[PDB]
Amino acid sequence: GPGFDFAQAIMKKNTVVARTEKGEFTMLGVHDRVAVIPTHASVGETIYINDVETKVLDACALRDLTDTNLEITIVKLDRNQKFRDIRHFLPRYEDDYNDAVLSVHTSKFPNMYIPVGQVTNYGFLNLGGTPTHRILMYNFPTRAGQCGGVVTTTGKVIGIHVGGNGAQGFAAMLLHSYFTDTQKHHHH
Amino acid sequence: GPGFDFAQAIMKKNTVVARTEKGEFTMLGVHDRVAVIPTHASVGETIYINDVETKVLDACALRDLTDTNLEITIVKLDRNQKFRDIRHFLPRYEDDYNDAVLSVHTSKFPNMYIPVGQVTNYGFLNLGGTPTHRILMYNFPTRAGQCGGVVTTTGKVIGIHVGGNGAQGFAAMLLHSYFTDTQKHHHH
Ligand SMILES: *[C@@H](CC(=O)OCC)[C@H](C[C@@H]1CCNC1=O)NC(=O)[C@H](Cc1ccccc1)NC(=O)OCc1ccccc1
Numbered sequence: 001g002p003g004f005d006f007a008q009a010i011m012k013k014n015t016v017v018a019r020t021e022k023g024e025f026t027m028l029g030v031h032d033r034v035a036v037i038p039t040h041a042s043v044g045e046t047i048y049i050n051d052v053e054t055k056v057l058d059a060c061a062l063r064d065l066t067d068t069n070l071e072i073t074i075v076k077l078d079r080n081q082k083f084r085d086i087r088h089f090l091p092r093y094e095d096d097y098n099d100a101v102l103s104v105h106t107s108k109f110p111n112m113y114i115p116v117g118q119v120t121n122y123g124f125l126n127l128g129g130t131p132t133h134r135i136l137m138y139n140f141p142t143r144a145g146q147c148g149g150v151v152t153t154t155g156k157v158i159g160i161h162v163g164g165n166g167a168q169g170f171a172a173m174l175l176h177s178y179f180t181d182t183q184k185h186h187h188h
Numbered sequence: 189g190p191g192f193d194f195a196q197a198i199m200k201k202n203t204v205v206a207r208t209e210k211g212e213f214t215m216l217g218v219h220d221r222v223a224v225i226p227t228h229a230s231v232g233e234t235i236y237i238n239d240v241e242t243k244v245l246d247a248c249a250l251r252d253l254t255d256t257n258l259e260i261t262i263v264k265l266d267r268n269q270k271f272r273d274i275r276h277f278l279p280r281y282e283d284d285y286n287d288a289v290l291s292v293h294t295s296k297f298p299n300m301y302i303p304v305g306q307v308t309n310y311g312f313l314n315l316g317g318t319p320t321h322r323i324l325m326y327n328f329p330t331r332a333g334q335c336g337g338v339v340t341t342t343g344k345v346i347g348i349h350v351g352g353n354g355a356q357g358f359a360a361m362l363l364h365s366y367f368t369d370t371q372k373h374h375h376h
């Protein structure tokens with residue numbers, strides 16, 4: 001059955017409530033002070049984390065080599081506590097999955113779990129008017145208030161919720177290589 | 189940890205979406221064509237069950253011997269399918285419980301699970317102006333849309349959600365003897 005225990009352990013140690021000009025989002029912390037949030041949350045230079053105003057030291061809105069929105073923004077936060085490192089739970093590659101759970105952590109829903117069933121590598125999505133790539137789809141009627149929600153199976157954190165049409169929900173993929181230590185250049 | 193599997197098996201086989209003049213409620217089916225719903229759903233002589241209009245053959249608004257609201261209404265429904273008999277999962281007596289789950293099945297939330305933690309035998313509640321008895325309390329900020337939601341621990345179905353003040357949630361108890369086959373008299 002659905003990996004509720006795994007979902008709950010991720011929610012407990014690795015989510016915070018984030019709030020921007022656009023409202024509240026579930027926020028998954030990945031390692032150190034690095035977390036993710038859907039790009040359309042429109043992150044600025046400060047953000048509320050569990051109602052504490054917090055400096056955004058870095059924010060990268062991911063796009064692929066076709067210059068198309070992936071709907072993931074990676075943020076680095078000025079806070080004291082480090083997130084438990086969960087990069088080993090991120091999938092290496094695109095894939096399809098069985099029996100996933102969607103978990104939400106907002107002020108309205110501090111702890112909620114939704115089995116969304118089978119998750120398919122969907123690809124292209126016109127996301128409320130923005131072309132977007134690398135989308136996962138599940139047949140569940142997801143709602144406003146669930147963006148940022150964490151999509152897991154047992155042992156894998158696979159995406160964060162970003163959209164729905166009333167019948168399906170859509171998550172942006174998380175891939176291991178989004179977060180590898182690496183060597184870089186000028187990005188803003 | 190929380191008995192998510194048990195909660196899910198109850199939701200799968202024993203809940204329907206019920207809709208009255210007051211809106212949608214999670215509805216737990218108990219045995220045969222007998223189900224429960226919070227009294228303030230204000231059940232009439234027909235009700236929608238999964239959007240199918242359905243005759244209410246009987247509705248009993250439970251009150252205790254002090255003539256006080258228990259907030260449970262037991263209904264008998266004119267439908268073809270029998271509910272799986274779950275009376276053996278109902279507690280015999282009032283009690284306190286650990287690590288409970290609150291499960292909701294409405295159109296907006298067809299399948300949602302919320303760990304509400306410790307559940308205490310609370311007693312008297314002024315429920316939005318109606319004196320009410322035999323209430324369970326959990327420290328979780330429950331919301332509109334969750335009434336009727338099923339409160340379980342592993343192996344026990346213990347109540348249905350009926351109220352909250354923004355910080356706590358309140359469920360009406362379910363006791364085994366509410367549903368025993370019995371011999372009766374004139375009740376309307
Ligand atoms: C999540 C964000 C939100 O509600 O707004 C501020 C918190 C929301 C979830 C979505 C709404 C209906 N059902 C759902 O599962 N996502 C969106 O509204 C999304 C735009 C957005 C905004 C902020 C952050 C991330 C994304 N737009 C959307 O879902 O449009 C509907 C759609 C989707 C796919 C195909 C066609 C139409």
Ligand SMILES: *[C@@H](CC(=O)OCC)[C@H](C[C@@H]1CCNC1=O)NC(=O)[C@H](Cc1ccccc1)NC(=O)OCc1ccccc1
Pocket residue numbers: 210211212213226227228229313314315316329330331332333334335336350351352353354357358
């Ligand atoms: C559930 C019913 C509802 O939303 O209305 C139509 C579907 C709702 C849940 C409650 C609302 C805020 N947080 C919650 O967990 N219950 C009530 O609103 C309840 C009256 C009612 C109506 C229909 C069916 C059952 C019960 N009233 C209520 O909760 O009042 C607030 C309160 C509670 C306890 C002490 C003080 C004040």
